[PDB]
């Protein structure tokens, strides 16, 4: 990744053994649960494009998801090139070339070129752009690997309301992470899929009830 030293200067530093093992391990234990996307973003702080490819390539299983991710990256690379085409010409001594989609993904660029763009003034953040594409791809995978549709989360007759709500929002989270959109559906299906007696309690609570008020009411 790129960090600053005591002079403030931005220098390259090797990816640490702790981070690499952490990423491989989190994938092994959590697979593509929605919560892995946060972890990837934090573990790839300051990463060069080379480092992001390293992290993804060290994953041993889930090669179907990885192949889907490659497709998504390639799709994003083409739109980058279309919206920011490369100006052709001889390179002026001490000038750097313009990054293509494939340069951002670290496939046709060298580490030195990557460092040059990231440390320029103004900086061309090829690492942050590539991370955007990868996270977009990972989001699609979490949705594909969501095991249950939210419509199939129904409170059991003997299930504590707290445990049902946990299951409800876990499924909602997998369906392309939490948003405000997930809230129009929430104020509706959470009540409709509740068990008989609790539904009566939630309906009697009225509109605009907070989770705290509903969860207290059905305790």
């Amino acid at each position, epitope marked *: 990744p790129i960090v600053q030293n005591l002079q403030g200067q931005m220098v390259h530093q090797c990816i640490s053994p702790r981070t690499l093992n952490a990423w491989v391990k989190v994938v092994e234990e959590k697979a593509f649960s929605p919560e892995v996307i946060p972890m990837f973003s934090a573990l790839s702080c300051g990463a060069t494009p080379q480092d992001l490819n390293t992290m993804l390539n060290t994953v041993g299983g889930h090669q179907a998801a990885m192949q889907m991710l490659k497709e998504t990256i390639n799709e994003e690379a083409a739109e980058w090139d279309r919206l920011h085409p490369v100006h052709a010409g001889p390179i002026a001594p001490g000038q750097m070339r313009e990054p293509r989609g494939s340069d951002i993904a670290g496939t046709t660029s060298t580490l030195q070129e990557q460092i040059g763009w990231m440390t320029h003034n103004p900086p061309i953040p090829v690492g942050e752009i590539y991370k955007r594409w990868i996270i977009l791809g990972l989001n699609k995978i979490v949705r594909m690997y969501s095991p249950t549709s939210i419509l199939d989360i129904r409170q059991g007759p003997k299930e504590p309301f707290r445990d049902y709500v946990d299951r409800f929002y876990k499924t909602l989270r997998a369906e392309q992470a939490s948003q405000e959109v997930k809230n129009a559906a929430t104020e509706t299906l959470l009540v409709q899929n509740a068990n008989p*007696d609790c539904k*009566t*309690i939630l*309906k*009697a*609570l*009225g*509109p*605009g*009830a*907070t989770l*705290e*008020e509903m969860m*207290t*009411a*059905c*305790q």
Partner: nanobody
Framework: DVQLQESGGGLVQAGGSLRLSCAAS????????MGWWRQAPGKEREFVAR???????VLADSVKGRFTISIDSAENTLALQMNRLKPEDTAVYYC????????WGQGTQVTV
């Protein structure tokens, strides 16, 4: 079992005040939530007030400036104090309490 019965409703002139009260058996602190709804002939059941244990009272906007809801654990009653009553406020008012399932009273008629 949990039993509730409202009383105090009736016909009053505009601008008057009234306190509806819903008596519950046992202790009110045992309930996890209580409140008030109303339904007038031809009008849909409308939500009036709610008090959930540990939380502040919430009131509907159509009554918010004029009604107040309070709980007296001493009298085991749920009070809704309604001042500046209007004819559009005419309806039958129901209390509910939530323990295990939801329980409702039979209602009291309010006519302005």
């Amino acid at each position: 079992d949990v039993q509730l019965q409202e009383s105090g409703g009736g016909l009053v002139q505009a601008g008057g005040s009234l306190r509806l009260s819903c008596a519950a058996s046992g202790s009110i602190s045992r309930f996890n939530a209580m409140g008030w709804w109303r339904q007038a002939p031809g009008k849909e059941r409308e939500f009036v007030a709610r008090i959930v244990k540990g939380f502040d009272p919430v009131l509907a906007d159509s009554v918010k400036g004029r009604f107040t809801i309070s709980i007296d654990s001493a009298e085991n009653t749920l009070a809704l104090q309604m001042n500046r009553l209007k004819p559009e406020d005419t309806a039958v008012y129901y209390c509910f309490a939530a323990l295990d399932t939801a329980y409702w009273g039979q209602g009291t008629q309010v006519t302005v």
